[PDB]
């Protein structure tokens, strides 16, 4: 069960880590929302779709940096919305295909009434999300952790 990033980095069987550099909106005025889409970046595929079927769940979603202070929001997984930082195990998703299928994780971050200025710093850690894969084949548990950085500063208009 190998997962890849749109850039080209890959996490082999067993798990590991992979930094993901996502492009956030240049400016997110208060009262509006900021969408960090990861289905366009993180992809996964089943190694042996014929006989096994993997189960993928978002174990943990943690916020870091200017997201933690200024941007408290939600996470959308397979059409279901949950708090962020996450507080519960998301439901499973079936992977039975040799083709690369996305990981439907979408962060929805909204600015709090704080002015913020430079809410998010370019190159800083803005999220950490944990994928868990346990197969219906044997006693299995792998963790795939993705560190989501921000390429551009997400300035919140003051007025």
């Amino acid at each position: 069960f190998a997962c890849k990033t749109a850039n080209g980095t890959a996490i082999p069987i067993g798990g590991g880590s992979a930094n993901v550099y996502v492009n956030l909106a240049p400016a997110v005025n208060v009262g509006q929302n900021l969408v960090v889409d990861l289905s366009t970046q993180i992809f996964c595929h089943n190694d042996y779709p014929e006989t096994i079927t993997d189960y993928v769940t978002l174990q943990r979603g943690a916020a870091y940096g200017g997201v933690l202070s200024s941007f408290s929001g939600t996470v959308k997984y397979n059409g279901s919305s949950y708090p962020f930082p996450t507080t519960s195990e998301t439901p499973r998703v079936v992977y039975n295909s040799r083709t690369d299928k996305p990981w439907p994780v979408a962060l929805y971050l909204t600015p709090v009434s704080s002015a913020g200025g430079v809410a998010i710093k370019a190159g800083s850690l803005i999220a950490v999300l944990i994928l868990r894969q346990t197969n219906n084949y044997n006693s299995d548990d792998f963790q795939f952790v993705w560190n989501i950085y921000a390429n551009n500063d997400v300035v919140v208009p003051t007025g």
Partner: antibody, heavy 119, light 109 residues
Framework: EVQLQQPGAELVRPGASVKMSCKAS????????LHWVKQTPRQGLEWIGT????????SYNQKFKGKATLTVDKSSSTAYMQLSNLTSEDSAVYFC????????????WGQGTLVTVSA | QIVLTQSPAIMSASPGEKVTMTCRAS???????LHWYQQKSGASPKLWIY???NLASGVPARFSGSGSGTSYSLTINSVEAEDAATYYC?????????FGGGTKLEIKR
């Protein structure tokens, strides 16, 4: 299983620095945030700061800022606190803790390093 | 910053009665980010209630957290001798954090 072992005590001369330790066992070290906290008979538990071992991201409370520097080694699965310009009001029991496996709650703690400032 | 004020800070519960411990917040807080920890004196705090309603692993089913928004509280139904400790509330998810005060339950024989 999962343990966050701290050294028992730490005696430090005033006006100098002391470094504690927090060894984490039973899980992938560079996967969860390690937090530090202090406890006194005075005002309640004060959150010292955070560290994410997988990236080195640290963040301090707002007031143990020139006194706390959280660094990890990632090789022997340890987290380190060094206390700068340590005075007599910084004598307390320090806990290192970790978030839960499925949420931001202070799941597993440590025994606590009981730092006393004296000569 | 959002501060936490634990109201009683001192209680006295008979070995068979109820008790309630409020933890007021300075401003409204998402109910999924308040957690109650129990620290018996001379020991390390242990998770007792998370998301303000759920019960941690191993905790007796007497404790029942409730409350939302600003006045999250706690309830011990059949107060036993082993619930004499200090209970703290923490709001994690804003960044400043808080461990406001503490309530030291005392069991009265």
């Amino acid at each position: 299983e999962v343990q966050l072992q701290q050294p028992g005590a730490e005696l430090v001369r005033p006006g100098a620095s002391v470094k504690m330790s927090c060894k984490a066992s039973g899980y992938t070290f560079t996967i969860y945030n390690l937090h530090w906290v202090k406890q006194t008979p005075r005002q309640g538990l004060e959150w010292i700061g955070t560290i994410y071992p997988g990236d080195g991201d640290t963040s301090y409370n707002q007031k143990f800022k020139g006194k706390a520097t959280l660094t990890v080694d990632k090789s022997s699965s340890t987290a380190y606190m060094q206390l700068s310009n340590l005075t007599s009001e910084d004598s307390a029991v320090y806990f290192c803790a970790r978030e839960g496996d499925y949420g931001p709650w202070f799941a597993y703690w440590g025994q606590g390093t009981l730092v006393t400032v004296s000569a | 910053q959002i501060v936490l004020t634990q109201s009683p800070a001192i209680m006295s519960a008979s070995p068979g009665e109820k008790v309630t411990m409020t933890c007021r917040a300075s401003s409204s807080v998402s109910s999924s980010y308040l957690h109650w920890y129990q620290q018996k004196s001379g020991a390390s705090p242990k998770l007792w209630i998370y998301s303000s309603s759920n019960l941690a692993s191993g905790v007796p089913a007497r404790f029942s957290g409730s409350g939302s928004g600003t006045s999250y509280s706690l309830t011990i139904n059949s107060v036993e001798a082993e619930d004499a400790a200090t209970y703290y509330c923490q709001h994690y998810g804003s960044y400043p954090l808080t461990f406001g005060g503490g309530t030291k339950l005392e069991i009265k024989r």
